[PDB]
Every structure is written in C-alpha cells, then in structure tokens.
Design a protein around this ligand. Structure first.
Ligand SMILES: *[C@@H]1O[C@H](CO)[C@@H](O[C@@H]2O[C@H](CO)[C@@H](O)[C@H](O)[C@H]2NC(C)=O)[C@H](O)[C@H]1NC(C)=O
Ligand SMILES: *[C@@H]1O[C@H](CO)[C@@H](O)[C@H](O)[C@H]1NC(C)=O
Ligand SMILES: *[C@@H]1O[C@H](CO)[C@@H](O)[C@H](O)[C@H]1NC(C)=O
Ligand SMILES: *[C@@H]1O[C@H](CO)[C@@H](O)[C@H](O)[C@H]1NC(C)=O
Lengths: 296, 106, 111, 228, 109, 54
C-alpha cells in the first residue's frame, strides 16, 4: 500500500527503504511506476541513474539490516507520483521482487523561497551563493557538500559552521552567516574547470531543505585583479562595484576578520591597499557578499 | 495541460490559455482564453468598510489585471476594521476581524 | 490544482475501522479554517458528514470523529462500524464545501 | 592612399566591452616605417598596437592601428586623431574621430498564416521602433542560448517616417515551419543606450498570439467573496 | 497611438522589387510608408528579402480601411501581385459566454 | 469549380487587367472563410444541478 509523503516544491524527500535478511544482497532499486505498467528506474545499486535526476539522488549506504535510504532534492512538479523501492537482481522491476511502494505529492503552495539554481562563475574568479534554511532553525550547524554520482550516492563535507574545512579547499573557501534572519552565505573563489558541479546546502536542523546549487565554470577573465602570489598589497576593483564596500580579510577556519586600508580617487574603477597564510579582498553590498579574489 | 496567465485574487479573475492539438490535419490548432470571473454580489464597495453601498458595476479590464479596488476578500490576506464599542464608561475602540480564521496571530 | 492530499483508495472490511489522514499546506488560514469530510453523492454536492467545528451528522453519530493536528499539518478522520452503505465517493477538505480545496477519497468496503 | 578612421559601435561595447578607435592606413605607397599614433586632445598616449596587414593584391601596403580606451572616455567627447608618417607624406597625416535620446519600443511579430501553409519556413520578425539615435544591437536567443548569426539578419536604422529623427530597425529569423507545433519560444533581445540593463528582451511563441476560441465563464453567487 | 503594418517580401531573385501602399484604390503618399533595401536571405542562398512599414493611427485601423501592399517584380507572370489586411482579417473567433446564476453550483480551486 | 474543391481551401484569385487601373492590374480573392462573423453562443445556466466545477 502507499505510504503517503506530502513534500514541498523545491524541498526534498527521504525514502526510507527497509527490507529483510532475505533481500540484503539483492541489488536494490527505486523505480517510478508511470502511466502504463513499466517502471522507468531512477537509481540502482549496480550503477544506473536517470538523465533527469542529475546531482540530486543520494543512495545512502546499506546498513546491517539492509535499510538503505534515498534522498531526492529539488523536487519539481513532475515528481508527484508513485515510487517503488525494491530488491531484484537485474535492477529492473520484475515479479518475485519484494517491492515496497510510496506515494509523493509535491505541493505548489510552498513557503520555501526561490533561490537561484545556477551560479555562473568565471575560472579563477568568484562565486557567492546563499543557501536558505528554516528561519525557526537558526541556531544549528551548517554544512556543505560535493556531488559524486548516485550509485556511489556520496556527499562529503567541505565546510561547516563549527569551522572544519577540507584541506584541499583552504584559502579559497569561507562559510558566512551574514545575512541572518533566513539565509547563510558561502563564498568560493580561485575556481577551476573541474570544480563545477552540484553543491548541497545541508544544515543540522530537524526539517531540511537540502538546497542544491549548480556551479557552471565557464571560460572567462577575472572580474578582480590581484598580484600572483605575494608591506603593501594592492587590489584592483572595477567601476561596477561603486556602491560596494571594499575590504580585506584574514582567512582562517574562523572566516573573515577586518583589516584596515585607505581609499584613493580614480584609479584605472578602484584600487585599495593592504598596508601592514591566505587573504582575500572581496566586496560587500549592504548585507550580502560578492566578488572575492585570493592571494598567498 | 494549460498555463495560468493570471490568477488575480482580489477581483477573482482567472485568465488561462491552452493550445488545442486538433484532429491530425495541418496546423488548424486553436488557442483559448478561458476567463473565469466569480462575481461577489454581496460584498460592499469599500471591501473593508462594511457600511458602504452594495455594488452594481463589476468592471473587468483584462489588460489591467494581466500586467486597486478589489471586489472579493482574498482568503489568505486578512482584513480588519475598528469599531467604537463601549462597555460602561469608556468608548474603547478595539480592532475587529472582518474575515476571521485568517487574522489569528501566531 | 488544490493542494490537499489524502489516500486515493481505501479498502476495509465491514465492522472494522478506518483512519483517513488528509494533509494541507500548514498556513495560518489552513490551520484554523473549517475542515470537512463530505460525501459526494449522486445528483449533487457534498453533504457534510462530519465537520471539524463540531458538527457530526445524523448518520455518523457515535461512530466518527475528526481531529486536527495543525503543527503536523494534517487532519485525521476515524470511522468505526463500517457497513456497505459506507462505500462510495468522499472528499476531505477545507473551507466551504463548494469551492474545491479538497481531495477525493474513494471508500470501498468489502464483505 | 586612404587614412580612414572607424570609431567603434554599441555592438562592440555590448559584445566585448573592448571599445577601441581604429584607422586603416591603406592603399598608400608600399613601404615600412609608417608609424601609428593615436593622440587625444589632452595628449595621453595609447597601448601596444600590433597585428599589421600584408600587401594588397593591388600592390599597396595595408596597415591598421589600435587605441583601447574606456567607455566614458569615449561618450564624453574625447576626440581622437590618428597620425602616421609615410614616404610620400613629408608631414604626418592626422585624422580625427569623436562623438557628435529616446527609448526603443520593441514588438515581436509571429509568422503569418499564409506563410504557415507552404509548410516550409517561418520568419519571426523583431521590430525595434521609435528610438534615437542609431546603432542599436539585436540578437536572437532560443531557450537562453545565442543562436547562429547566419540564421538571422538585422536591418539598419533607417529614419522614421512620422517621428522626426527617430530611427527604426528590423530583424528577422528564419526557422522551420515544423518548429511551430513545438514552439521553443524564440526570445529576441535588443540592446540600446536609453535602457537600465541595456536589454529589453521579448519573446513570442505559438502559445502567445491570438486566441481563436474564447470562453468567458463567469459564475455569480450571493455567498462568494472569499476567492479561494 | 500608432500602428506600423509591415509587408514581408520573401523568397525572390533577382533584386529590385518595388513596393507601394494603396488605400482603397488611390495610392498613398511616399512619406507615410518606408521600404527598406533589398538584402540576401540568411537561410536560402539564391534568394533575397525586402520589407516595408506603413505607419497609421490606431483609429484608422480601428475603423475599417484596407491598406493594401502591392509589389512589382520581374518574375511574377503578371508582374504585379498584392495582398491586404484589415482589422477583421484574421479568423472566426467564436465566443462561448457561459453566465452561471445558480447560487449552489460552485467552483473548483 | 467542383463543389468539394471549394470546401478545402483554394484562394481563387480573379485578376482583372484593365487599361485604366493605377498600375494596370488588380486581383481579388475569396475562399469559403471570408465572412463567418464571430458566431457566439451565450449559455445561461440558472437553478441547475450538475455537480461539475465552474
Ligand atoms: C474605506 O476605504 C478607504 C480607502 O478607500 C480605507 O482607508 C483608510 O484605510 C486605512 C487602513 O485601515 C485606515 O487606517 C485609514 O484611517 C483609512 N482612512 C480613513 C479616512 O478612514 C478605509 O479603511 C475604508 N473606510 C473605513 C471606515 O475603514
Ligand atoms: C473553455 O473552452 C475549452 C476548450 O473549448 C473547454 O475545454 C473548457 O471547458 C471551456 N471552459 C469552461 C469553463 O467550460
Ligand atoms: C465552450 O465551448 C467548449 C467547446 O467549444 C465546450 O466544451 C464548453 O462546454 C463551452 N463552455 C462553457 C459552456 O462554459
Ligand atoms: C457553444 O458553441 C460551440 C460551437 O459553436 C459548441 O461546441 C458548444 O457546445 C456550445 N456550448 C453551449 C453551452 O452552447
């Protein structure tokens, strides 16, 4: 029988597939019984996924009870139907397979806000994304993620709010908190062709909207000019950032602490100084954050 | 199958549209304009002041609600007025609830 | 489309009891507005069998209760003592009977 | 012998933001040591101008210069003078170029019904009227994707018959007629100087356009007034 | 305020078409309409296209009259063709009004 | 014409060549759909039981 799951538009859903010790090592799956009799399969354990669910399905690892779980995120209006986890060998829906259905409903009357799904960053540039989270659940431990396929179904932790950043991202990465009252910002610069992908805004809250944002690493030129790898250090801002407040950081696992400088007049735009690990010279627009570039 | 062009909820108009994929002849497909007004007929003119005259004219310019004086209450938005009720000495002007089950504070 | 969502198909033997949950988008109107469970008959309309304000019809008296969990975001209809006149076409919904905001449960009792 | 000076355009400021004042020193005597210089009114020098051309097929030398200055260093009347010295020219020859508004009303016109019965090709017509002055840009995108520039054509800003000195322009895009069961919505984005974004993108599909079947359905009811 | 009716002359070869804009039979002024230049076709190689606009008031289109677009080109077998528009030059448009006055039969969210 | 041929299309231009026209040739046209002036059916439903949504 159905196990009705009323979820939200641009929210997420967790299918808790619990099966038995007869079907532990059988190759589990999740079809989606559509308008005829066929199941257009969505995950597998032997490899497959969908052209649709790219970046979003997370097939969690098995337990000792065989109770693997599946996360879908960013649900859109065309996911609103019967889903079916099951355990047959060749990963298609066949008879003899201990299935266990569900039933979604993706309501369109959401209270979830509409964050942009595609962040476009130029190579060696800057991205600054906001992940929304439940305004009741303000005091909780944020996290972030990568994307690694569905048959893997992985999402290892890049940063958090307690402080621990991965070592291969240090210097170019900072989780923020401003603006509060609903959001939390993450700034990532010093981009790369292969660090485009699907990036999940976890939180340690109770009801979770695992927002997935998509980094598109285009070709480009940096919007900000900084020395290569360097007592005064300059930072050269374009004239589009005229309202934006120009400031330097001292990066650590604790984020940005302020460091003073003095402003000039017209400079071929704007130029600031660093009179005096890794440090940046980003911009700030009132309460949000924009383009930062890193230096040694 | 259809796409909502307008879902206006203070006049209660609801213009949608839909292309009818016809009998499989050439492109003699039709396009629609499914307007769906719902006329109040007991709401006042000033919707919030309920001491106003009733209504006669209901004018729906369907450009000027595709891009005010509302005719219906919206269901989610909640409406109030202030009345001079007394109880003894004072005339304590307290704040009523025209449409209830929407003005419940959290 | 109307955002209530219940069970589309319910099966239960005569004498046994039914629990039918229907969900709503937990707004502050939908927490507090009237929640019904009407029987869509033939030749017309809902006949409210058990509202949530406190009406309970002549038929469902003593055998039904509708409760409302507004924080869970749902309302649940318990009906004991089924018979085969309890088969047919029902709606669980909010607000007025006519104006949509509903869902269509098809109750189907077996012997 | 021609020292001809082409200043840049809004279709180069919008497409590249590399605004640059150019002069071709071509058809002169086929010789080297013809030095480019781009001189302002004030006397600021310019950047590394290279990328010279080879000899003409009619046996003359062709050369080009560059001057990449900023945008409001061009809209603010900063006159430029390119100067070159030749073998026949005992003096360097100077040639100056400099800078001498209304909004565009963009309408987009679908294919006509007579054209959609030959079952061959539908030409969607952008139309950029009532603006001044000239050199607008128009580009054609299908689902957020710049289309192939050989598939569309833009006209030139010919002057308006009614309004005095306003300039209207066209552009058309020829698609398959077979596209007009499936649509793909065909955005046409203009780019003018009297705009906030300098973008006034519009779009028309088969789903837009005239209905040829209405149906008003207005219901009336004493106890309405909540508009669910 | 206004209305620019446009005339789209596709698919022809060679160049040099004429386009003129008659109203009811007497041809209009040559400062009302504007014809472009001929220009080659972006899709098809051995063709061209030209254009014209005619700027009329809103009322003179919301009244009636036709504004026909008559061209001249040396491969038509009679060497003049013409088309026309009007305010009413489209299609049928059936309306389908449906006034509901029953105070019980109600609607659908 | 044959009757069904008028019931398909066939814009049927009649080109009339005079020696006193403005540019010496006009031509006019008809097919079956040159009138048909907006057939509209009103439909008042009053006091009526349907149970269908409006
Ligand atoms: C009648 O409508 C008027 C405007 O058409 C309403 O306007 C004012 O509304 C605000 C909102 O409650 C009040 O604070 C103002 O005091 C109103 N102005 C006046 C002069 O009363 C108004 O609410 C309606 N009339 C009444 C009596 O409520
Ligand atoms: C409007 O027209 C469409 C198509 O003709 C039809 O399906 C629909 O039922 C009509 N609207 C109403 C309210 O009946
Ligand atoms: C409008 O006409 C459509 C088909 O043309 C018909 O199905 C529908 O019932 C009509 N709408 C009404 C009566 O509201
Ligand atoms: C209205 O007319 C159309 C065709 O003229 C027809 O399809 C439809 O059924 C009619 N409806 C009513 C209610 O008259």
């Amino acid at each position: 029988e159905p196990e009705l799951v009323y979820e939200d538009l641009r929210g997420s859903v967790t299918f808790h597939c619990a099966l038995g010790p007869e079907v532990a090592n059988v190759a589990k799956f999740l079809c989606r019984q559509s308008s005829g009799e066929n199941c257009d399969v969505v995950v597998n354990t032997l490899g497959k996924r969908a052209p649709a669910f790219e970046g979003r399905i997370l097939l969690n690892p098995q337990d000792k009870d065989g109770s693997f779980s599946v996360v879908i995120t960013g649900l859109r209006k065309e996911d609103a139907g019967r889903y079916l986890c099951g355990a047959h060998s060749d990963g298609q829906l066949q008879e003899g397979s201990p299935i266990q259905a569900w039933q979604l409903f993706v309501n369109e009357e959401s209270t979830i806000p509409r964050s942009p799904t595609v962040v476009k960053g130029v190579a060696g540039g800057s991205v600054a994304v906001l992940c929304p989270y439940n305004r009741k659940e303000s005091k909780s431990i944020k996290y972030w993620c990568l994307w690694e396929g569905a048959q893997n179904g992985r999402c290892p932790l890049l940063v958090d709010s307690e402080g621990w950043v991965k070592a291969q991202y240090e210097g170019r990465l900072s989780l923020l908190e401003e603006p509060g009252n609903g959001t939390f910002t993450v700034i990532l610069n010093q981009l790369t062709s292969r660090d485009a992908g699907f990036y999940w805004c976890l939180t340690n809250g109770d009801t979770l909207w695992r927002t997935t944002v998509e980094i598109k690493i285009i070709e480009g030129e940096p919007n900000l000019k900084v020395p290569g790898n360097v007592l005064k250090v300059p930072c050269h801002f374009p004239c589009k950032f005229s309202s934006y407040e120009k400031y330097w950081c001292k990066w650590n696992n604790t984020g940005c602490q302020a460091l003073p400088s003095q402003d000039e007049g017209p400079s071929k735009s704007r130029l600031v100084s660093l009179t005096l690990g890794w440090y940046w010279c980003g911009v700030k627009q009132g309460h949000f954050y924009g383009e930062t570039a890193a230096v040694y | 199958e259809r796409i909502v062009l307008v879902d206006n909820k203070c006049k209660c108009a609801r213009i949608t549209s839909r292309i009818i994929r016809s009998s499989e002849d050439p492109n003699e497909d039709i396009v629609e304009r499914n307007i769906r007004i719902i006329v109040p007929l007991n709401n006042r003119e000033n919707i919030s002041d309920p001491t106003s005259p009733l209504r006669t004219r209901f004018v729906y310019h369907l450009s000027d609600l595709c891009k005010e004086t509302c005719y219906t209450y919206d269901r989610n938005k909640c409406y109030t007025a202030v009345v001079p009720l007394v109880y003894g000495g004072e005339t304590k002007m307290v704040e009523t609830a025209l449409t209830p089950d929407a003005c419940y504070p959290d | 489309k109307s955002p209530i969502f219940g069970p589309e198909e319910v099966n239960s033997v005569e004498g046994n009891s039914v629990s039918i949950t229907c969900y709503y988008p937990p707004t502050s109107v939908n927490r507090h507005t009237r929640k019904y469970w009407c029987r869509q008959g033939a030749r017309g309309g809902c006949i409210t069998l058990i509202s949530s304000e406190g009406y309970v019809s002549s038929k469902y008296a003593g055998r039904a209760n509708l409760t409302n969990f507004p924080e869970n975001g749902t309302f649940v209809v318990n009906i004991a003592q089924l018979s085969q006149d309890d088969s047919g076409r029902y709606k669980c919904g909010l607000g007025i009977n006519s104006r949509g905001l509903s869902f269509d449960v098809s109750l189907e009792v077996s012997q | 012998i021609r020292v001809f000076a082409i200043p840049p355009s809004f279709a180069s400021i919008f497409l590249t933001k590399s605004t640059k004042l150019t002069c071709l020193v071509t058809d002169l005597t086929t010789y080297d040591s013809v030095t480019i210089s781009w001189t302002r009114q004030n006397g600021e020098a310019v950047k590394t101008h290279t990328n010279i051309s080879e000899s003409h097929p009619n046996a003359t030398f062709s050369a080009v210069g560059e001057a990449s200055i900023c945008e409001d260093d061009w809209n603010s009347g900063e006159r430029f003078t390119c100067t070159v010295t030749h073998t026949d020219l005992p003096s360097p020859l100077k040639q100056t170029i400099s800078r001498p508004l209304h909004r565009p009303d963009v309408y987009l016109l679908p294919p006509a019904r007579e054209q959609l019965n030959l079952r061959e090709s539908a030409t969607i017509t952008c139309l950029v009227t009532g603006f001044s002055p000239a050199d607008v840009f128009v580009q054609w995108m299908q689902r957020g994707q710049p289309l192939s520039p050989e598939k569309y054509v833009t006209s030139a800003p010919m002057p308006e018959p009614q309004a005095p000195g306003r300039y209207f322009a066209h552009s058309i895009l020829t698609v398959s007629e077979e596209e007009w069961n499936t649509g793909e919505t065909y955005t046409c984005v203009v780019a003018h100087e009297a705009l906030p974004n300098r973008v006034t993108e519009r779009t028309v599909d088969k789903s837009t356009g005239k209905p040829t079947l209405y149906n008003v359905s207005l219901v009336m009811s004493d106890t309405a007034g909540t508009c669910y």
